[PDB]
């Protein structure tokens, strides 16, 4: 019922809420207790595919009925045809030592045979059962794409319309267009999280079906099998002519099978099936690192680079020096002519993306005067960290002029400090940590579009300093992660001075 | 693709993208890798032949058709017939 | 070094010195009592105090009950010479317990030198003692001697548990508030204590006992000694300064009396109830009092009524008040010295801090009211000791404060009858015709503390004048154990004031006690008419009276309140239907199991929300449990919280009143540049303070008005949870008693075991509830309170900016050349915000302390923690079980926690478990973890032979760990011989094993309602259902030994064995796995510490089938990866890739700063290469073209300037954890890169390449720079 | 801080160390019988601390 969208500000407020809500809907999961453990369930799965959808809740109905309730063909198993068990009639009169070591051979053949049977059951599981969960995975993934498409079309129509007829300034439209593009990427990244969710959920389910449904049929088949074998082997040993009664009892005992001889279930192996080279490559290509700064000294050369595996380009003064920091070589910026710059399309930010910045910094603190250290700014938007007074200032400003300007006290003591900054658009929360403490926790609901350049510039004007382990992430950081980063890096076996 | 990668026709409807050498693709592979490569959709996507393995007809109580949906086969040959029932797991290893 | 150096016995005859009949000051005639001087200036009179105040001399209960929550009256108590002898000994023991702590040692010394000032003189040239500060000590010869004293401990008055400081007054002077001080009489008893409820510690102590806990009497005495300390130094806060509360509303207390003095004494959060403005007022008040005492001393020219010298006396008081004395002898008070002293007396000596020292359970706030009274005896050491109090070291009593749990420790605590009646003081809350009125009485101390707004005063709206001089108050740092240590190490323990000869006072010493203000008894049974069921109703509806009838749970609050047999539950209707059903005997146990599961399930429920900032989790059942907010579904509660924030939890919305802040006015200095610039800087400094002041203020209003509401809600949720357990138990117990003797006989049903299980479930639930409620309270601070402060602060910054700029411009003449730089300073400073950091204003919120609690939680769940320390293998758990070590047990000399058990009767280890921890239960969950290394099975005799290694079986019931060919096995057995086994299988026909002869991490967890689970290297392997198992009763001991193994040469390695009292989850198991892997030391292939001077065969993790070889020795030759490895076998037993094929590496010390032959992470080393049994040096010439530097093996003398030094790195690996890295460096410190390999033609040559150093850590699983070092080991043993 | 090893530059966890002071000559740290630390003349007597 609202008045139509006219300002660019109104478009942003709209687009952001469109994005947050989409994220909340699509990434929804609930952890449940199952036969085989705790599984992280995709909440919308039933409403998407019409599966266990006749309830008012798919989640509780799935907790009730179990993993096998999601697929249409429940009993596909075929007990395999075996090779029946006969002990040769030529061993009936053998002497102990030879009888003994010949049954040892039969023992191994048997336990190997058990393993074969299990394999056969695993193959049937894959072919008959997993095939159906993979169908569910694909359809669920298609559902996510279908939904994503609906969203993007909704966004595209609104943008297309404002551009079509509205008084919004030409170059404001321009920014809107660039910014929306970044938001559409943010929406794919969110879609991707959801498609990973359905993969874990459904893979776990399929594995639970093997433990709960297939495996026990195997165990049934195997105790019938070793019960038989046990019989034939006892009957055989009694019929042995050339050994005595004390020998028979020790022999029957040596050769008897029990359930443990065939309990092959290894749940970690079940899980490791789905870790392929591809699954790994995808992890490394899609992880949160947008920048990971490394540095080291080659003979006659200082090396600086980015390990994120992203598109980051690095440009830096030729004479920048390196010095051992906390865990590695640190960059020395003299404050006068030296600068370094990192280029990634992600760095421009936008309306809807989240990110974290962290690094170690030691500043030989002199002046109180406000000076650029590091930031990304264009057309007076984006973020900057300044040296000021004895501390830092974190500045954040949007295209409408709304600002965060936050003083972090006492950071230039000429001691190393671990700076962590976290920007979370889903929770609308800014978090700033110094070392192991949380120095600022703020709402950023009032900050809208921070689109900046694709370049982050490390200047360190007027304040010679050391910078180490600079990192940019496309996700927010929690307090547990900060503590873990901080302390893990800190014990490398080195003792430190004040 | 790591799962049933010879059956994908059933699990997936493919949408094709043009690859130009060497602007999209060179001796190092896709420019900007397999994820972020910028490839144009092929105008051929609309020419793709669609022949469903089966069609799911969803009617209402009055026996009239609400929707007709397509399921596609994997392309592979079938049966015939059941392998697991008639396969004997070898006891002797040679 | 004891405080009381004589051990008195009450029947000891009077000596006239430390044992005498004495007269204390009194209004009229007083009958002499027998007293004991336990220390200089400190006496004990073991008598019920009817003498102090002849007015109240009768020990009977009063006509009208006192308005306290707990009281006890026995007139005969302490009428016997035996009870007197026990009082004396108990009090003495408590003094000793206090003294044995750093904090207590100071306090006791402070009290002794705290001699009451000599203010008796009406002529200021003379110094005289004040009479009521003395006693008369009657000698054997009938004469009395007058003697001055600081402290007397006397027995309680009619109310046995009411303890207080009493002292005598002066016609005019207030001796407790004027800094003079007065002799302190404390009514105390060591023969009773209070019970209380505690839900908070479950975070760190998940096993915390059920029901009431007992206050450690040492805390109680210390509390009074602190008051005494204030009163002796004349700094006590006026008793008419009280924290007023709002009593008018139906949910508010009818009344509560608590004083600023008490708040000050409690410490912790209670003391933060007093705002800065007032805390300042006091400090200044007593500082001036101190200054007055200085001027009284300065004008005193002679002494009277003693043989001691004015010199000595003036010095006594110089040392009491910390006076500064100039060259002339004049006294003054240094604000610095005083601040330090007043701080120690009021912020260091606090109940809160004593608790930190005693390590006992204690109420965190006075708002956690004593619920009960208990008879105790602390004199016997088997009961209570000086060091441990009730929680006795090396026993069950040392864990989870069990020593103070009244039910677990029940022999030490006897429940008396609270003289304060049932609903003695209450309010009456009535819902209206939801059929006529249903009214319930609510205990006064079950209602809400709502502080009056006139409690928080601030000057925030008062402006200031900034000045060239104006200067900055310091940070005012929080109190911490290390600050206390600062005071401690600077404290002077040498000089106690002498006990001087003083002129004899009159036979009777005339005086009366200081008058206490008369307090209005608050109103009783106020009635309230309400339209809606309240929280108090919802909670009351959860209660029942015991009886023979069967109760049923209902989801209708109305029903429950109307019928004695109906108890309200917030559990699902499914739970209701199930718990109510009449259950056949044959299904009874399975029924109970289901109920216990459902209970645990519903109370453990946690919904996570990703929508909002400060609240991560929500416990949804709080809504229907307390009727929080309103409406129906718990989905409404989750919804309303997400939407409206934490405010929906509050009973009342607190007023936070923050005014327009007082602006700054700057004094101008004409033509003075330096002064003008200082004034500008000062205004900016004071601005930073304005921010800190406003933040302190809000934090203070939040602790009092909000965090107290949440603390109540929390206490009530535990009450709710306990009620639900009682109800469910009562219904189950009714069902059992319906059975025939024969039916019962076939059902082993232990209600105490079931109770124990439900109490653990309630604890898990409270852990979550606690976290949820903490986040809620804090969220309300961050979001609903702080922002009002930040708005007032930004408006202040704006005004100051305008003022400061105006000041700069008006002064542009003086300030010329500096005008621009000053504008910038002002505009830049005042355009920032100073962020609120909660960790700055309160103790519990630091980030690290969250991780700290998690570590505590796992350590406090360890009932056996078996480590090698000093020279012995012992139990590091608080139970301190005994360990018996066989003669043939072998300990690895390099790491002595590595234990080798051979197959011999003598090679064994036996743990004798304390009874409290021997497992006997149907329902109790438990876990075990340990590392083991199992030699390859070489011989067919090992086939189908299962042998035990860790045994906890007793008469075929218990658990055990056993091994077999390629198996690790866990067995569970109940007393009916029903068993469950769960196994980890590993093959010996494998190229290279993650397991065979390698250290493995084993974890087994047992959930009696569900499953038995086995983990390997942190990962879940197999699980089996155990819920069909009945009672399991395990062994009184644990036997580590090889039992039944037919391989005579067999043995095992084992280390780091633990037993836990819960079911470990996936997270805890992984963290355990990681923590114990010792990531700071490099490992060899087998899992042992990597070592110097030990030859190793090499393996590259990228291509395990390859081994290292040397083409040619020398600089023109190279090393490469060769293959295939070939195989080793014994038919039917093992088939493996040969591990001993290759060239051997030896790691030599280069930079090593000690001699222990262990290779630590980041050690700088040389690597030697063994080729045809000769040693060479691993080196390269890094000058060769290309980034991959080809490694060579060189003559050790010929290495010259080549790159040799190698930096050793230790990395984490999955299912191995053996990853080793080597970073090669030249002699200038430069990096030549990690050692790895590269293809040259078809040869794979060992290379140092900086391409590795450009890579992130774990990339794929396939590195090329990750290595394994394989030493020859008896457990593998092929032919080299 | 001094190390038994001339080549050792940086101090690490578990290193063995000799503490020295410059007053007039170089004085090295020893432990007395009262467990009170004192500066002495002779590097040989110096106690090696972890
Ligand atoms: Ca009732
Ligand atoms: Zn008190």
Swiss-Prot record, chain A:
Disulfide bonds join 36-208. Signal peptide: none annotated. Residues 1-282 are annotated as: N-heavy chain nHN. The 133-Lys-|-Lys-134 bond is cleaved during long-term storage; the cleavage site is masked in the M-PTC complex. It comes from the Bacteria. Has 3 domains that are structurally very similar to those in BoNT/A; light chain (nLC, equivalent to the light chain, residues 1-408), N-heavy chain (nHN, residues 409-829) and C-heavy chain (nHC, residues 830-1193). Belongs to the botulism non-toxic nonhemagglutinin family. Forms a highly interlocked heterodimer with botulinum neurotoxin type A at pH 6.0 but not at pH 7.5, called the minimally functional progenitor toxin complex (M-PTC) (BoNT/A, botA). Assembles with botulinum neurotoxin type A (BoNT/A) and protects it against pH-mediated inactivation or protease activity at pH 2.6 (the pH of the animal gastrointestinal tract) but not at pH 6.0. Necessary for neurotoxicity. This is Non-toxic nonhemagglutinin type A. It comes from Clostridium botulinum. The chain holds residues 548 to 1045 of 1193 of the full protein.
């Amino acid at each position: 019922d609202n008045s139509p969208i006219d300002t660019d500000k109104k478009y942003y407020l709209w687009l952001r809420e469109i994005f947050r809500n989409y994220s909340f809907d699509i990434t929804a999961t609930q952890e449940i207790n199952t036969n085989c453990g705790i599984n992280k369930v995709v909440t919308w799965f039933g409403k998407a595919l019409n599966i266990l959808n006749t309830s008012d809740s798919f989640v509780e109905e799935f907790q009730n009925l179990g993993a096998i309730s999601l697929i249409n063909k429940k009993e596909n198993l075929s007990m395999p045809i075996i090779e029946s068990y006969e002990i040769p009639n030529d061993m009936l009169g053998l002497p102990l030592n030879d009888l003994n070591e010949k049954l040892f051979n039969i023992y191994s053949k048997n336990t190997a045979y058990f393993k074969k049977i299990y394999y056969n059951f695993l193959d049937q599981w894959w072919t008959q059962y997993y095939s159906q969960y993979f169908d569910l995975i694909c359809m669920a993934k298609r559902s996510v794409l279908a939904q994503e498409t609906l969203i993007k079309r909704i966004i595209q129509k609104k943008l297309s319309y404002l551009i079509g007829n509205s008084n919004i300034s030409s170059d404001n439209l321009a920014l809107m267009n660039l910014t929306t593009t970044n938001t559409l990427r943010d929406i794919s990244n969110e879609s991707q999280i959801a498609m990973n969710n359905v993969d874990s959920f459904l893979n776990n389910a399929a594995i639970c079906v093997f433990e709960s449904n297939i495996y026990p049929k195997f165990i049934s088949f195997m105790e019938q099998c070793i019960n038989n074998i046990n019989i034939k082997t006892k009957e055989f040993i009694q019929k042995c002519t050339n050994i005595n009664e004390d020998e028979k009892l020790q022999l029957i005992n040596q050769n008897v099978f029990n359930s443990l001889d065939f309990e092959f279930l290894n749940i970690q192996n079940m899980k490791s099936l789905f870790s392929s080279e591809t699954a790994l490559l995808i992890k490394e290509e899609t992880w949160p690192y947008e920048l990971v700064l490394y540095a080291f000294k080659e003979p006659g050369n200082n090396v600086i680079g980015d390990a994120s595996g992203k598109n980051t380009s690095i440009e830096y003064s030729k004479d920048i020096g390196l010095v051992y920091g906390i865990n590695s070589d640190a960059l020395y910026l003299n404050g006068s002519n030296q600068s370094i710059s990192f280029s990634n399309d992600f760095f421009e930010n936008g309306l809807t993306n989240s990110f974290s910045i962290y690094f170690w910094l030691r500043n030989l603190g002199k002046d109180t005067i406000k000076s650029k250290l590091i930031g990304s700014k264009e057309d007076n938007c984006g973020w900057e960290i300044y040296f000021q007074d004895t501390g830092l200032v974190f500045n954040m400003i949007d295209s409408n002029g709304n600002e965060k300007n936050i003083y972090l006290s006492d950071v230039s003591n000429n001691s190393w400090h671990y700076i962590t900054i976290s920007v979370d658009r889903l929770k609308e929360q800014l978090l700033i940590f110094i070392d192991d403490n949380l120095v600022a926790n703020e709402s950023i609901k009032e900050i809208l579009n921070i689109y900046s350049s694709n370049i982050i510039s490390l200047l360190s004007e007027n304040n010679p300093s050391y910078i180490e382990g600079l990192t940019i992430l496309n996700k927010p950081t929690t307090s547990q992660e900060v503590l873990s980063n901080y302390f893990e890096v800190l014990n490398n076996s080195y003792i430190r001075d004040s | 693709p790591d799962r049933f990668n010879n059956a994908l026709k059933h699990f997936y409807r493919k949408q094709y993208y043009k690859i130009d050498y060497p602007e999209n693709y060179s001796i190092n592979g896709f420019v900007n890798g397999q994820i972020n490569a910028q490839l144009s959709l092929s105008d051929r996507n609309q020419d793709i032949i669609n022949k469903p393995e089966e069609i799911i007809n969803l009617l209402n109580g009055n026996n009239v058709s609400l929707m007709r949906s397509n399921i596609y086969g994997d392309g592979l040959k079938s049966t015939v017939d059941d392998f697991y029932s008639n396969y004997k797991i070898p006891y002797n290893r040679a | 070094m004891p405080f009381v150096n004589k051990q008195f016995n009450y029947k000891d005859p009077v000596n006239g010195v430390d044992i005498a009949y004495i007269k204390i000051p009194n209004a009229g005639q007083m009958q002499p009592v027998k007293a004991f001087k336990i220390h200089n200036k400190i006496w004990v009179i073991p008598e019920r105090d009817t003498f102090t105040n002849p007015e109240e001399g009768d020990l009977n209960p009063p006509p009208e009950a006192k308005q306290v929550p707990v009281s006890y009256y026995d007139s005969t108590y302490l009428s016997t010479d035996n009870e007197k002898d026990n009082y004396l000994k108990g009090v003495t023991k408590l003094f000793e317990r206090i003294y044995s702590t750093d904090l207590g040692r100071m306090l006791l010394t402070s009290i002794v030198r705290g001699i009451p000032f000599w203010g008796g003189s009406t002529i200021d040239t003379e110094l005289k003692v004040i009479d009521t500060n003395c006693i008369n000590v009657i000698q054997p010869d009938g004469s009395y001697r007058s003697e001055e004293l600081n402290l007397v401990i006397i027995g309680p008055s009619a109310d046995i548990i009411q303890f207080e400081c009493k002292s005598f007054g002066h016609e005019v002077l207030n001796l407790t508030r004027n800094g003079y001080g007065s002799t302190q009489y404390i009514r105390f008893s060591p023969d009773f204590t209070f019970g209380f409820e505690e839900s908070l510690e479950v975070d760190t102590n998940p096993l915390l006992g059920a029901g009431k806990f007992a206050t450690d009497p040492a805390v109680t005495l210390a509390h009074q000694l602190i008051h005494a300390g204030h009163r002796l130094y004349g700094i006590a806060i006026n008793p008419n300064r009280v924290f007023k509360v709002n009593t008018n509303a139906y949910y508010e207390m009818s009344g509560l009396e608590v004083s600023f003095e008490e708040l000050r004494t409690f410490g912790g959060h209670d003391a933060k109830f007093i705002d800065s403005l007032q805390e300042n007022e006091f400090r200044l008040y007593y500082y001036n009092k101190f200054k007055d005492i200085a001027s009284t001393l300065n004008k005193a020219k002679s002494i009277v009524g003693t043989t001691a010298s004015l010199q000595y006396m003036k010095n006594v008081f110089k040392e009491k008040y910390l006076l500064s004395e100039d060259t002339s002898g004049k006294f003054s008070v240094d604000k610095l010295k005083f601040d330090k002293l007043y701080k120690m007396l009021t912020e260091i000596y606090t109940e809160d801090n004593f608790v930190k020292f005693f390590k006992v359970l204690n109420a965190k706030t006075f708002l956690n009211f004593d619920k009960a009274v208990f008879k105790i005896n602390i004199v016997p050491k088997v009961n209570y000791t000086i060091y441990d109090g009730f929680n006795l070291r090396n026993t069950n009593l040392a864990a989870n404060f069990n020593g103070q749990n009244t039910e677990i420790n029940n022999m030490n605590f006897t429940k008396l009858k609270n003289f304060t009646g049932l609903f003695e003081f209450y309010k009456l809350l009535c819902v209206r015709g939801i059929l006529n009125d249903l009214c319930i009485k609510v205990n006064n101390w079950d209602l809400f503390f709502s502080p009056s707004e006139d409690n928080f005063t601030n000057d925030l709206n008062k402006g200031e004048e900034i000045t060239s001089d104006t200067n900055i108050e310091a940070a005012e740092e929080n109190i911490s154990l290390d600050l206390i240590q600062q005071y401690y190490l600077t404290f002077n323990f040498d000089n106690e004031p002498e006990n001087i000869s003083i002129e004899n006072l009159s036979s009777d010493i005339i005086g009366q006690l200081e008058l206490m203000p008369n307090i209005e008894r608050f109103p009783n049974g106020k009635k309230y008419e309400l339209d809606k069921y309240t929280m108090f109703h919802y909670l009351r509806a959860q209660e029942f009276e015991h009886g023979k009838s069967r109760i049923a749970l209902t989801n209708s609050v109305n029903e429950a309140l109307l019928n004695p047999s109906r108890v309200y539950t917030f559990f699902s209707s499914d739970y209701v239907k199930k718990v109510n059903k009449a259950t056949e005997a044959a299904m009874f146990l399975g029924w109970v199991e289901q109920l216990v599961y459902d209970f645990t399930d519903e109370t453990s429920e946690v919904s996570t929300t990703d929508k909002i900032a400060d609240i991560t989790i929500i416990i949804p059942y709080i809504g229907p449990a307390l009727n929080i907010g309103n409406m129906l579904y718990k989905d409404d509660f989750v919804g309303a919280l997400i939407f409206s924030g934490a405010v929906i939890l509050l009973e009342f919305i607190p007023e936070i009143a923050i005014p327009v802040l007082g602006t700054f006015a700057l004094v101008s200095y004409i033509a003075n540049k330096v002064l003008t610039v200082q004034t500008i800087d000062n205004a900016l400094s004071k601005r930073n303070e304005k921010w800190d002041e406003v933040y302190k203020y809000i934090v203070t209003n939040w602790l009092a008005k909000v965090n107290t509401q949440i603390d109540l809600i929390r206490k009530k949720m535990k009450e709710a949870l306990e009620n639900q357990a009682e109800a469910t138990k009562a219904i189950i117990n009714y069902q059992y008693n319906q059975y025939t003797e024969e039916e019962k006989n076939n059902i082993n049903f232990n209600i105490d075991d079931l109770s124990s299980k439900l109490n653990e479930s309630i604890n898990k639930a409270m852990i979550n509830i606690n976290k949820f409620l903490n986040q809620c309270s804090v969220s309300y601070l961050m979001n609903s309170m702080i922002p009002y402060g930040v708005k007032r602060l930004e408006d202040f910054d704006a005004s100051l900016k305008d003022a400061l700029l105006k000041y700069i411009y008006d002064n542009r003449g003086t300030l010329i050349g500096q005008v621009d730089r000053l504008k910038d300073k002002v505009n830049n400073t005042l355009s920032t915000d100073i962020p609120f950091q909660l960790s700055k204003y309160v103790d519990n919120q630091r980030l690290l302390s969250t991780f700290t609690e998690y570590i505590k939680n796992i350590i406090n769940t360890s009932i056996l923690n078996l480590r090698y320390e000093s020279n012995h293998l012992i139990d590091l758990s608080r139970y301190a079980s005994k360990i018996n070590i066989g003669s043939k047990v072998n300990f690895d000399p390099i790491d002595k926690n590595q234990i080798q058990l051979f197959n011999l009767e003598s090679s064994k280890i036996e743990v004798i478990l304390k009874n409290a921890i021997v497992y006997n239960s149907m329902y109790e969950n438990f876990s075990t973890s340990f590392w083991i290394r199992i030699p390859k099975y070489f011989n067919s005799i090992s086939l189908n032979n299962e042998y035990t290694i860790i045994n906890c079986m007793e008469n075929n019931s218990g658990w055990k760990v056993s091994l077999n060919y390629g198996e690790i096995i866990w067995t569970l057995q109940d007393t009916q011989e029903i068993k469950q086994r769960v196994v980890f299988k590993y093959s010996q026909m494998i190229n290279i094993s993650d397991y065979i002869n390698r250290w493995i991490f084993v974890t087994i967890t047992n959930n009696r309602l569900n499953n038995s689970k086995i983990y390997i290297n942190g990962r879940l392997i197999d699980q089996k259902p155990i819920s069909n198992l009945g009672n399991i009763h395990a062994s009184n001991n644990i036997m580590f030994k090889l039992d039944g193994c037919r391989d005579t040469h067999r043995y095992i390695w084992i280390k780091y064995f633990n037993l836990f009292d819960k079911e470990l989850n996936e997270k805890e198991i992984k963290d355990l796995y990681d923590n114990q892997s010792n990531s700071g030391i490099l490992k060899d292939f087998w899992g042992d510490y990597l070592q110097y001077d030990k030859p190793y065969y090499m393996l590259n993790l990228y291509d395990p089938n390859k081994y290292v070889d040397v083409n040619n020795v020398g600089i023109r030759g190279y090393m490469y990866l060769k293959g295939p490895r070939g195989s080793v076998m014994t038919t039917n037993i093992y088939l493996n890739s040969s591990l001993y094929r290759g060239a051997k590496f030896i790691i030599k010390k280069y930079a090593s700063g000690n001699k222990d032959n262990i290779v630590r992470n980041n050690d700088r080393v040389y690597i030697n290469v063994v080729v045809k049994n000769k040693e060479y040096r691993l080196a390269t010439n890094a000058s060769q073209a290309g980034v991959e530097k080809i490694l060579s093996a060189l003559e050790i003398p010929d290495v010259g300037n080549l790159s040799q030094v190698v930096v050793m790195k230790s990395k984490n690996d999955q299912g191995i954890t053996n990853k080793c890295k080597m970073n090669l460096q030249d002699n200038n410190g430069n990096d030549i890169g990690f050692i790895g390999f590269h293809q040259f033609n078809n040869i794979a040559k060992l290379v140092a390449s900086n391409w590795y150093n450009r890579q992130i850590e774990r990339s794929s699983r396939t590195l090329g720079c990750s290595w394994e070092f394989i030493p020859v080991d008896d457990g593998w043993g092929e032919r080299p | 801080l001094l190390s038994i090893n001339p080549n050792k530059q940086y101090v690490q966890k578990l290193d063995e160390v000799i503490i020295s002071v410059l007053d007039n000559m170089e004085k090295y740290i020893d432990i007395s019988e009262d467990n009170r630390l004192q500066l002495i003349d002779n590097k040989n007597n110096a106690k090696k601390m972890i």
